[model samples]
Target: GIDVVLVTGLSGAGRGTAAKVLEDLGWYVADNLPPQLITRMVDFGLAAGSRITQLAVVMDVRSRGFTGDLDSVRNELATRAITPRVVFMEASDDTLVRRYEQNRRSHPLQGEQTLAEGIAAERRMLAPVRATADLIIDTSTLSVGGLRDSIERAFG
Candidate 1:
């Protein structure tokens, strides 16, 4: 009879881990998106009905265009069956850098600039959602298991 959880946050802050946790919780984890077509995708999820309740859309800074539309997205979701909740994940710069280094991959959004640049850019882009998030998770001290527990406590 309902739908969605919108998960958007700092990139290295365990968002993918959160997605996996959502999956284990029996939510439909759409790790593929929320950047390109979140509103339309929400429409699709609703059309799928009760079977598709608990859809989680993961959004990053991959699409700047979507930034301006978040207000509209929020307004639309407010009227939906379950009324989507935004879960914003966060971590400190030190944690993010170390994690990224451990993984041996540069921050995806960093591109030519330093990884710090990308995080800064992402923070700026995600500020709006952070301000209004239904849940704000600080993952700096959380291991994946810890984060999972946190999500379950809040969303289960």
Candidate 2:
């Protein structure tokens, strides 16, 4: 059986870092993948042979044209008898705002709104998604190294 992980969360959370850590630990990592490609990628893993026992996919609401829902995605995967671990990254609004400012990147949902507003919108949109998470990683106070250690402990 192939072990699958779905990495998702707010834009500034540590989803990327978690995916990278999983990749370093030898999981096949696909970053910023749309919801539609999940099953296709899982199919690839099954066909790729015994070596690909682990798969980690990174996704966010930022995916363009992403109209799909996580529950449906999970249902689709259930047909294949593979249950995926959902890792939802979380951080405080203050932390997220700081990161966005430091990186100089606008929030995906920040159209014509303040960064705080954007974060709020994202939180509302992802409330249900967060409910589906198997593991929630709060990156508010975690350093990169600490985040790495957490991922390794969880997925190693």
Candidate 3:
């Protein structure tokens, strides 16, 4: 069975950074894959016959049908006996706000909403997902190297 990791969480918590580390560690990594495509990704990797033993797909609330699609993927993978690991990344509200200010970028969920509100909204939506995660990382105070070390320690 292909070893799959679903990397998801709040936008400012370094999902992309973690994904980059996984790629460097020789995992096949895909970003923002539509929920419809997750099973196919697993199937294609399985069909590749060991060429892609590990797969990482980065997901976020920015995607359409996020929760529903994830639920479907969970059930579908269970049928295939492939229980993909879910890694949820998060940071403190203050940390997230600071990061957004530092980067001068608005949160993906921040359309016509305050940054704090968007973050709060996302946190609420992701509560159940976080509860089900195999691993959860709080990147509130981690530097890039520190976060990389965290990923390597877990996935390397």
Candidate 4:
């Protein structure tokens, strides 16, 4: 049932690209909505579903409130007997910094610290999920196509 997978991880780990790849495979992606409430509509998933078969709420992309109820959402999904698949994306600090610079975008967590510092801070928030995620994609060495293949390997 798609496990209500959360496509979350490092800032520049290629999740946006990954989602685009999934679209070719009949997956739909959304990032700003809260979780848990979606699970209540599992009946819809069971029925003749939407035009898209998969829905992934990519979280933690910023200090944005997209993650406000993330934990609770997971808990609710768990209680509903839904083994939510958490898709965690990753890359080394050097890679993240390079990408951030190339894109000319400051890290969302880069308050007063350097980009490295922001990466570290965001990395801290992501570390726990790193170990327990159902699928982990290390995008450091992956081109966009390779990342698409990785996500398909995990979620497909």
Top-lDDT structure, candidate number:
2
Which is superior by lDDT, 1 or 3?
3
* Cα shift from native, residue 39, model 4 (Å): 2.7
Tell me the tens digit of each residue's lDDT in model 2 across 1-156.
778899988656777789989999999888768777888877876887658888888874554346646887889899999899999988998997787775565544442234554665677689799999999877678899998988888885
Ranking by TM-score: 3, 2, 1, 4
* Residue lDDT tens for model 4, 72-135: 7766677757766777778998997787775665544442334553675677688788879887
Tell me the spans in candidate 1 whose CA falls farther than 4 Å from its real position: 48-50, 105-156
lDDT rank, highest first?
Answer: 2, 3, 1, 4
TM-score of every model versus the real structure: 0.61, 0.63, 0.63, 0.52
Per-residue lDDT of 1-156 in model 3, one digit per residue for the tens?
878899977757778799999999998898877566778877776786757778888864554346644678889989888888989989998987777776665544432333554666678778889999999877778999999998888775
Candidate 4: C-alpha lDDT: 0.64
lDDT per residue for candidate 1 within 85-127, as digits (tens), equals 7788889989977777765554444333336547667787788
Q: What's the lDDT for all of these models? A: 0.70, 0.77, 0.76, 0.64
Candidate with the larger lDDT of 1 and 4: 1
Of candidates 2 and 1, the better by lDDT: 2
Q: Residue 10, candidate 3: how far off, in angstroms? A: 0.9
